[model samples]
Target chain A: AWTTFRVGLFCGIFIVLNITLVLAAVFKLETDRSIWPLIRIYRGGFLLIEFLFLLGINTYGWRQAGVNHVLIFELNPRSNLSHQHLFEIAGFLGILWCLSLLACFFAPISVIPTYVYPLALYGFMVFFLINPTKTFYYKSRFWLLKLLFRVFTAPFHKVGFADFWLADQLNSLSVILMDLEYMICFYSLELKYTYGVRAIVQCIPAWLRFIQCLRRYRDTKRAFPHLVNAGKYSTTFFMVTFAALYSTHKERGHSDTMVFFYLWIVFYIISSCYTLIWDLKMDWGLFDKNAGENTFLREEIVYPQKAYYYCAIIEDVILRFAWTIQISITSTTLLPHSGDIIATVFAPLEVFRRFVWNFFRLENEHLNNCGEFRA
Target chain B: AWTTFRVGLFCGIFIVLNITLVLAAVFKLETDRSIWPLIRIYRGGFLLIEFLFLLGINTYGWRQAGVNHVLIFELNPRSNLSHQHLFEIAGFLGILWCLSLLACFFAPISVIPTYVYPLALYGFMVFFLINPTKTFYYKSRFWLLKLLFRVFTAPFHKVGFADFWLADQLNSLSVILMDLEYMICFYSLELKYTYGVRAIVQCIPAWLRFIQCLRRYRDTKRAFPHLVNAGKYSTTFFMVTFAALYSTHKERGHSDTMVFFYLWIVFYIISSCYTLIWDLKMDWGLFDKNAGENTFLREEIVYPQKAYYYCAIIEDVILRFAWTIQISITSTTLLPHSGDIIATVFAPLEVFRRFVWNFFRLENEHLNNCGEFRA
Candidate 1:
């Protein structure tokens, strides 16, 4: 009876989450900020479902399961602040190395004092040497503190040449994924909900002033072209990664992979379509001189901006909170069915799969004739 | 008394061996067979020294000193041959692969046969997978065989692209030294006597055959410039191996490295001298046309018949044997100073040191160009 009841509950949750997400996406059919709040509400529900699934699992999901070292602590009921501190440290270093690499390699850096580049390299070296490799920071502050801890601990490890190369490979991948997350967040209303709201209210003036300095110096164009290029390149990154991971980690016994394979396909389509549309619109408005005169470009660019903005907001809200709700509801096809009742399951596997995919496929189809981000 | 005993024993053996070698070399110096026998004897002695060291260590030295797992048989003396059969198989495959690569990369057949290239690649893949991971052959083969085992095994263990690249760098040194050896054997019988007698005899027949083949083929000069190029490349191979082994084997301590370093300087001098004087003279005679009234071209055109024949014999016997000897001696510098008391006391260091003297210091000093049998 419990099994039957649980199954039905999960089914209902899946239906509701999917419907809410689809509707939110449809509403955003154009960018509308008003729909964003509701989309956020939907995402919140999804998160709740995810949490409940975790809760259900804690109460009675399975007796014993083999778990990865990274995941075990996240769902463990007995996990405490002490363990969380350790995890936060690992996550922080991983993210710090990963995200900073993107910004350094991809995003434009405004002219800083001469010491900045070297300082950043040194800081990254420090971050890289900290052991216990991980992903998905539970709390941002935790990583900040870990970075602080690493300040003193780094001298002892003295990262050797071999380990340094390993770190480079690890950190490069981190940069790829984190920057993608950063780009996606920027296009979504989640910025308003989590970071952009605060930034707009408090940080925008200083940020704009900083940007204006770079623009004035004529270095902004040179430094940050990769940020936009990265967004374009992100398409290849995700697709290649998914293909590789699928090849490497697909179920051993069967010729055909599991249903989760479809999840990746959908992920690619959503990410690709959203990226292409946004990139095209952004380019036309920001860079093109004759964009308004061309009818095809004008029509696609003009109306979709507002519509897509709202749509992105709505999509953002739906994706974030709905994910959490799916965790609670237990039946969402959007989430992992077999593992990680609380946090996103199969994410690492997904990343690893993508790595394998990218490795083998050198020439990507979508890379042709994409406009350069800057000179 | 103990020091005197060691010194007397060393001096007696050294003098007796030197006298025998000089006599043999002198006798061969006058013959038409060239100095191949002397070069072979020199190379064979070095090879024997390497075997004695490896044997002494794997058998009694390391084990008696309480090192664990240094010798596989020591760790599991009673383990059946089947337990290590896979290792033997891997080693055999590695040999096959290495030989294939040697044939393709170093001496490919004319027309570039289809069967050869793929066979080489296939052999490389199998060899690459199995060597470093299994220490069976290194542990089980006779001391002489063990060094040979590792000669091919090291390539398999290289985990990254850079390591493999470094190994190639080492190989280059070997090629250079080979060139030096060939030229010396070709131009100077007096120098060949210094190498020893047994080698000259063993190698003479093959050398003669190669010369005969060269006479049969009119295009020896055009078809085989790489014979010199390969010899030139051999020096880098020797140096790189020494450096890598020195860097990695930190446990051997600085004293061991000091000895190797000491020997290396000597080795370089000897090698450089051998090249600059004996080898360089003929090279300049042959290649530097403007500087001489009797240029290599003039000579070649005049005696095109026997010159290529002479070149072939030198390349096949003296060049290869000398290159192998230099490699074995230089590589043995990586050995810790223990076991095989003779080797430990001075063999490696002496080889390296003596060559350093021969390399840098030269006065045209001896105009003796008589072949070993010609003495």
Candidate 2:
């Protein structure tokens, strides 16, 4: 489904489109603020509708392929995604963060603050966590509840920081501090409350995985470059997301509104977990097996340019949008602030949605050069 | 002067360093506003010093190689730079624009606005324009005087925009509109006064070139890439810079602060001229003969990773810095206004200085990796 040249052309066109949108927005808004509300409404409404449409389309596509929702959402056991994958997950969350922000601005305040935000973050997490395929749901649900209760009762779970392991301790402690700040913000219902708790609990798994990561590194110190990549990405993602949230908290002179703070934390936790699970699924070869290994033709699997492009789109384009938004939102003094905040947030998504839509709109043959057939 | 691996490594480190700076800036500035000004002063001071130090060192290095100041600054023949080269020039100017803005904030207003800005833009332009190697300078200096007078008397000298020439006219007109706006800004003495009129007069050559470009395309239709890459870059550079400046002007409700407008135009004109002259010099083969043709060893020529890296650094790092600054400056509403703008500007210069420093430090090895000896 893919020609070498076509893939390059596709990316080139995509970049051109992105630039055009940004340039258009900057110009349109700057030259005539009178048109701002009109553009913002049309743009935001259009994206929301498109997002819903895509959701329906993708769901239908999955169903027509004889796949159940459970199977679609569940993580496979064999996939071992790299740090890159985790980074990509972080990126999507960032884009979604912007989208939610725009949605909040347009919608009635109560809906975003009270309903959609929690449902998207915690609702999705709970659904995934309790999936029949997840071991946590099947075996550890009760035990995990008790542990969550115990941690709440006595949360002073400091293990080490006084030892000469200063480097590791400082690094971990800094990360923990960031998490603690976010945790506080979460509980205050300043953002996504349920999602915050989910994220805190999610850290438990990360710590558990960290132990495994270290063990693997010890065993294959010289040979395996793959060791701890996931952990590295996980920690870095948390550090970054947490840091941005915490700074925003301080920037508004510690404002009452910490919705953004909560939003990013929720995004960080959910997307981080989602990416991890997806990686595992890939390692488990579930995507290939269930979709049929033939879903990737010999050339497609061997070359995998499409896969590369997809990842890059998520990582570079999607992730960059998030960073741009975060910088705009947080560093109030360093950068000059102009333009409608909601419009700016929405504009990137407008381009991003178009990008994603353009990607899907391509015929399978155009996408992969060889249409993939399910095995 | 450069090893293949080292060049690659340099770019990798450059990227890493860039990310680190942004992250550090975001984290450091976000966490503690108390330390912001102190850090800003220290960081900015250190970079300014380094910039001066490198300028001296590089000039000394050039002298040590038996190169006179004229030869060092003047475009050498036989080093035909691509459109990419001109793009880099535009990029560097863009960065300097940011730096000047920063300087404007801290330094006395009159110095940056009245003296330094214009001198930097026009001084550099006049130097490049009058280079002995430039045919336009050599031949037209006398004739251009008479034409300048005529243009002032009758400004409405446009011929026609007819005869299936829609494509060329549209392209040229857009570029002219951009140039016109910049021309207006440049003349206002918001940055430069006389230099603005000079640029307006200089468009004669562009029109001449436009005719030439059209004729060549008509003749070849297939042979050429229609490449006046410099022109391509020039148009785009002007378009973006113009759009941003114009937006800012309108946003400020047509306030008198159009210095940025003037700055960008001056850069666009100067760099455009410099790049064109450099291209001519390359065509004349001045560099190859002096440096000795074999200075481009077989391997170096065949696989010139260093040259690629050098261009990439200038184009990517410098260009991105400019783009970042432009966005920060122009999109005032969307982004949160925080941090010392002066520091934001200086920080990039620090990185740039190091990049330039590293390029020079690698010279002897880089200049003759295989001891390129002319036969």
Candidate 3:
């Protein structure tokens, strides 16, 4: 009777366990257990599912705030996903991802194939992504691949809303690019960290945005905003290239006292400051001179939020100064897992900032429909 | 007087140096010199230039054979490339590629940076490809990227003529997939061979074609050609999978006498034979009963000379049976650089087969104009 009662209690504990409670258990183990493997393993899926799940939740949030993303992104009601389906797919994939992590904890490779589970998870993602088999959100899935191509081949196509939309999404996910590089290094047998390749990966998003600006200039034959916006992306190219080359020099045991290091720092700071300014003043359509009916915001606003505007503005500036976090991590060797800490934390920081930026950016786009960017 | 005369002779030798003579010198170095790195560096470029140069020539050849490729491939006459332009770009890239190999011989990492040259050449190809500046054949470059994307995402769209056209091109270049895997392994720090990854890489093309057939079945709502075509590609998927799994087991020092080995060989032979038969009967539209205007050839042929047809037929059947060469290479431990020899040569072998097959296949495509594939 005691054996049966104890077994029943154990089952109940597992049955009643919430996601937060389960996650906390892992968090504690990661705190107590080794930092090398257990803590690091789930970051990939955590990054993936949160971005997708939070994106699903946030899309609905905007819709509630009276943002008609359908027209904003040129959606088809039939083919386009409702927030519900987004939740469903994200949840489905999330469970598989979490379960893969669970399996990783269980057997390194005994009864369960430890690596295969994760590999299969990644495979299923690609399968759903490229596979246009009938039921897997047919037109919607293909639609994304179309726009993703357009964004990457940014110069070739006319600047559509979806194209730059995805480009900005890539910009926010630059940390994920770094994550991919690390994964490549891990799997492909690369040991030493090469900064030049990292520079190129980061520069890809910047280059896409830069090229898109140039394409618009060619089409319109106008120079102001195109040139202005082009500069924003152009600065990023130099910023990354500077950081990459300087670090590579340091890797070669060159003196850190060189003027090149200062130039890299100067440009890095300027680029960050420039982007933050552009976020509020230009892209978000805040800080209009004559049209400021509200405090430092545009004359017209969709969402009923005087307070949200202030909160988001405060939130934006703090996150935009994430370069401070970057600086803090890099300048010292005293801390444990300094790089790891920033890589894990700062990525979500950027995503959250972008999430906030989206509300106002879309608000601007809705109020003032940019020319061919629409449809 | 002797020194001056010799100097003049040396200048003349350098001035009169053609690509053929330069390549011959390297070929001699490769044959005589150590086999580690010097010779292997240029194979990537050699494979690239030859496929491109030959493709340019073959495209022109088809036009001369009375194929209106503009209609068959849905060419925009304004943006379409001529053979002259094709040669110009191929030659332009080819020289830089050759020059990069030249750099590799000069320095491992001394006064000259060895690796950067090849990386730059690859970069420039990407630049010209996706860069849609006012010049650089703005439309045609982007057009190729367009079709390449479509071919991979095969099941998404209605199969356009250019889509499946590139798919067949990929099928011909399956060896390149293996080459890419090796490059990844080389760069990524992987020293060991794993067949499963290679299987996935190779299976990508097969999977694309298979999905394209399934898409056609859905569209046409018919089973005969689609099912038959699907099975042809489906067989390839299993053939590669079997080969990969069995080979992986062999890597573990497992018994080769397992029934799995026989199953792999059976599928391999059947898949190749199936493809060969499909090439002649369905794709090329040869061996027609009513249209037996020539010996084992169709009446609606566009190209002249029955002898050419007969020669192509003979050439294709020989190349299709290249599995014999594969078996011969693996079964014996005596051959020096057997895999390397075939990897270098048989890629071109398959390309030549495709070159021959294209003449007849385009003839059938022009005659038949298969439905939605045209647009």
Candidate 4:
């Protein structure tokens, strides 16, 4: 029952089923792509599953590598959820979400109505996340909310491993997050349509990270060094905003758009370089006081292979600069709907980068864990 | 320099100047009342002066009544803002806001654009609140932001007198707060054009108070009693929602309107009764431990006049149920323009009620202040 192999097989199907199910819906139907919220709803229904699925694998990877994520997350070892539980939960969520996505798509043809399924999916998730009784892994479910609340009020609270971990995870989930914002718009006013502040939505996760960095500066009370760390996240915030602004202007007939184009590239390159450097130096704790036996990476690595470390380094470098290609593709095609399509395509690579990033992020954290962690 | 009499004279001029300026804009102009934000801006250009205006008077009243508000508000007397400063600020703001309100009205028939003035007013307020150089009463202004942020994150922070006073003050200023929401919608989406989540915005301050009540429960680690306090704010929240829903539906052609009409009345009466009772018993500390000479009032009263206490009781009771007459007239005349006009008419009474409420509230707080206050 607690095995990964068979459950992983089912979990894999859950992601693929919804993946193609939504894909088929887009291509098969006449997608009214201009009405942002209606189309943005389906932009990442599959993302909900993709994240939880990857999280389970990340959990398993940590266990295999002796990272001690349970302690890092401050989870009770006795009653804490395992990798198998996460996989099963993801798979279970996958099937339900897949069915709901299919139901909404079909409602356009049938009697149940277009909005009903979307409302139900949202309501059920809301209910599931906050379902007061001691059902549905209540501790884990509420732990998720506590983590979110902590992240939201990050400045007021102290820094923690889970805070840092969740901030990194959210950076890659901007797609899912922005889509939920559109959903709020979709339902908030009788399918309340065409909210123009999608610009604000895209920058929020990076902003949270910026706030997290500020919190760190407050806690450590160090001046210049932590300011540099905070500056990294702020630069990331600036880069996303420019990309969002570029997309906005480019969509609105591209008048004086080269300003944003130049802006995006300038910020994008520096941001990419800074985050990549930070990844290698501060976050992953590599390239710092190396023993020379390990070469470019740090000594006291958690995982066994030097190859994995270098491979992860290469992945971070390539994926960190993926925005250059993203802006390029969206600009080159000028295929209005294709930007959303291309973004979804590029979306997974961030996750892939993060997946590798996670292993090392945790590895670095755990290797240095002399019991100063607070979650 | 911090003299009260001349400052009062100037502040008096300021309030009357903007009061008529905005009133002139409304009845004198074409008055496109249906499009809410354009008109709502002027509804209370005067209220900026109105709040600080009354706040200064309230401050003056407390000092005269021996309330020890400096200690009650935990202000350092050497640096704290006095009523004179408040009056001067109000008078100054009144002049600027009056000019801005006048400019916006005049621009409709001239250059510099219609939206530009609204934007400027908001921008100036924003700059004034958060001006980094900090020239204009930075301590008091930043103190305002600190109070606001503390209230917003109320559940996380311990309860304080300033928090309670601000929460009560905000409940009275729902009109101003709701208009700001409309302003956000107005500017947020190409003059965001009709956001429906005004319902949510209306309830936010009450929700914050509910959270404050929850925090008190948490701090004291008591059960059931604090919940009753939290429930009072919630019922107030519910009552407002029904009133808002009634207004929305009644505006949208009164379909099944009687249901909301009945719902509003039921919640209105009960919420009114509960809050009125809470006012005397808990918040105002009246009719409790009254000695023989004091009769119905408390033994250790801050203010001297016996008539003033009874007069305040009369004012709160009458004004508290002013909503009943508010709806009655709106429903009776069925004058579409009259509701907004009438709401502004009734709006000041709430401030008047709150102005008096402040003296007694601070009196109760100071009487009970045993070096246990936290801010």
What is the overall TM-score of model 2 with all chains considered together? Answer: 0.22
Interface RMSD of each: 43.1, 12.5, 44.4, 34.7
Model 1, span B1-375: residue lDDT tens = 222222222322333334434544465444554334323323322433333333333333233433322222123545423312332243234333333423433335578753354335445544544456555454444442443343335423312222222233223223223333544554466442222232233233223323332332332343443244334334434443444444444444555766556555555554444444434444223333443444332232222244543453344334433444444443343334431243223434333332222211111111222111112
lDDT (Cα, 0-100) at B72 in candidate 4: 73
User: Candidate 4: global Cα-lDDT?
Assistant: 0.71
Residues A18-126 of candidate 4: C-alpha lDDT, one tens digit per residue: 5557666677556553545555675565676777778888988898988878877878878888877777777667667776766665455566676677667767778
Binned by DockQ into CAPRI classes (incorrect, acceptable, medium, high), candidate 3 is incorrect
Note the Cα lDDT for every prediction shown: 0.34, 0.38, 0.67, 0.71
RMSD of each: 28.6, 26.2, 26.4, 26.9
lDDT of 3 by residue, A1-375 (tens): 222222232222222223423754666445554434434445666666667766777787878987878887888755567665665566556656655665655445586556467667778888988986878788888888898888878889898787887888787766666556555666567331544565677678878988998998998888978888899888777766666666566667888636657877787788778888988887787778756469787788777868898888888888877843443233322133567677577777777787787778887787777434654
The CAPRI category of model 4 is incorrect
Which lDDT tens digits does candidate 2 get at residues B309-339?
A: 3353345434434433432232232123542
Worst 10 residues of 2 chain B by lDDT: B159-168
Provide backbone clash counts, one per model: 95, 39, 1, 1
